[PDB]
A = this chain, B = another copy of it.
Amino acid sequence: RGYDDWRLSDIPQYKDGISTYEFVRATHEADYRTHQAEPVAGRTFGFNGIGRLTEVALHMPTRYTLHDQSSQYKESPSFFQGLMGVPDRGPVDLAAFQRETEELATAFENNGIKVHWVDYPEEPANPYGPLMGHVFLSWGSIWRGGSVISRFGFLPGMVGVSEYLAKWAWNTLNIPPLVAITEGAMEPGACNMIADEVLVTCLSASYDQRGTDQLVAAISKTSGTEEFHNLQLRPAVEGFFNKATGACAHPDININAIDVGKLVVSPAALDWDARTWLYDNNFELIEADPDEQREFLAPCNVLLLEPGKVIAHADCHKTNQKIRDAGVEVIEVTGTEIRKACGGIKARVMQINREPGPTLADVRNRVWR
């Protein structure tokens, strides 16, 4: 479009004979996401919901990606094993880590999903030390309306990182920031949604109420839905993971949607109120295998590609058969080196774009019980 070819008809609020007041009022009334955020960006974006995922980012690990190679970890492995609480499966193997990363990328390419690659500087550090956990790009997943700077609850190695990923998203994809979390703790990228307007959070080391309130208020205004629901789990865990029980600070280790009104769910996830809400709203529950969960094989850390199809850890054999039994296709992918820190496959994927998908009304209307 030529610079001198623009006319007033190109302004959507403009009408011939409109008064100043009416034009201004029409402007005040416009939807941010569809009038400002997306047109300025020149594209749609956001991972909200359980519709068809189209675009992600991965990080190919280098030696600097390995948490056990930070000088602060070397100084006290037990401090970080306290924070993270995951079972010790030995040192991370760089080459095997790189191979399961390739395998995941191939799974995406084979399912028609665009993969961007995010790199970090050599010797990457923040004001408090080497970066740590920066392979877990879900922490930079993009919401309807824009990107989010997180407040990390337990991992100081992630200070600076949600900034880095959001800056990357702006510079590379033209995706704007929506909000910075500035109180308490809130790690929205580790949350999952179980319908178009239903978010799952936890109260945990990774989320307090103030942080949660701040996030939910921002994303609800750009969600593109009339309602917005937050289901808040209350896991019993001190740091990230409770190796006695399988309980986890992060929703995406606790629960995820596998189809319309079908969820895979940890046995350590659901307090009575959460169970009640899920029952009342007509969600069918597939229970993850208890040993897979407790041993931190991340059987709930599956990635929904679209209703009825997920990527899962290839060695979560029992949970995956239950998922297939519920009529869902499982794409098995190796994810073993990734689990030596605080996440699995879904945790390491930055979700950039997911198409609008089934709603809470759709869940409620499904006849199955």
Q: Which of B71, B76, B269, B272 contacts A4 (CB 8 A)?
A: B71
Contact B218 A244 (CB under 8 A): no
Contact partners of A268 in chain B: CB under 8 A: 236, 242, 244-245, 247, 268
Which of A50-58, A101-109, A179-187, A327-335 makes up part of the contact surface?
A179-187
Contact partners of A180 in chain B: CB under 8 A: 32, 37, 145-146, 176-179
Q: Which of B130, B159, B205, B273 contacts A6 (CB 8 A)?
A: B130
Contact partners of A76 in chain B: CB under 8 A: 8
Q: Which of B156, B177, B271 contacts A235 (CB 8 A)?
A: B271
Contact B79 A8 (CB under 8 A): yes
Closest to A210 in B: B28
Which of A86-94, A147-155, A298-306, A351-359 makes up part of the contact surface?
A147-155
Contact B159 A3 (CB under 8 A): no
Contact B127 A149 (CB under 8 A): no
Contact B160 A75 (CB under 8 A): no
A171 within 8 A of B: yes
Which of A10-18, A133-141, A342-350, A361-369 makes up part of the contact surface?
A10-18
Contact partners of A236 in chain B: CB under 8 A: 234-236, 247, 267-271
Interface string of A1-34 (1 = CB under 8 A from B): 1011111101111100001110111011000110
Q: Which of B28, B126, B242, B269 contacts A40 (CB 8 A)?
A: B126
Contact partners of A128 in chain B: CB under 8 A: 6, 10-12, 39
A221 within 8 A of B: yes
Contact B205 A24 (CB under 8 A): yes
Interface string of A283-300 (1 = CB under 8 A from B): 000000010011000000
Contact partners of A156 in chain B: CB under 8 A: 11, 13, 27
A36 within 8 A of B: yes
Contact B13 A145 (CB under 8 A): no
Q: List 13 A-B contacts (CB under 8 A).
A: A6-B70, A7-B75, A11-B156, A25-B276, A27-B154, A27-B185, A40-B127, A40-B159, A178-B180, A182-B221, A235-B236, A235-B271, A244-B293
A contact residues vs B (CB 8 Å cutoff) = 1, 3-8, 10-14, 19-21, 23-25, 27-28, 32-33, 35-37, 39-40, 70-72, 75-76, 79, 82-83, 85, 123, 125-130, 145-146, 149, 151-154, 156, 159-160, 163, 166-167, 170-171, 176-185, 203-205, 208, 211, 218, 221-222, 234-236, 238-239, 242, 244-247, 267-273, 275-276, 279, 290, 293-294
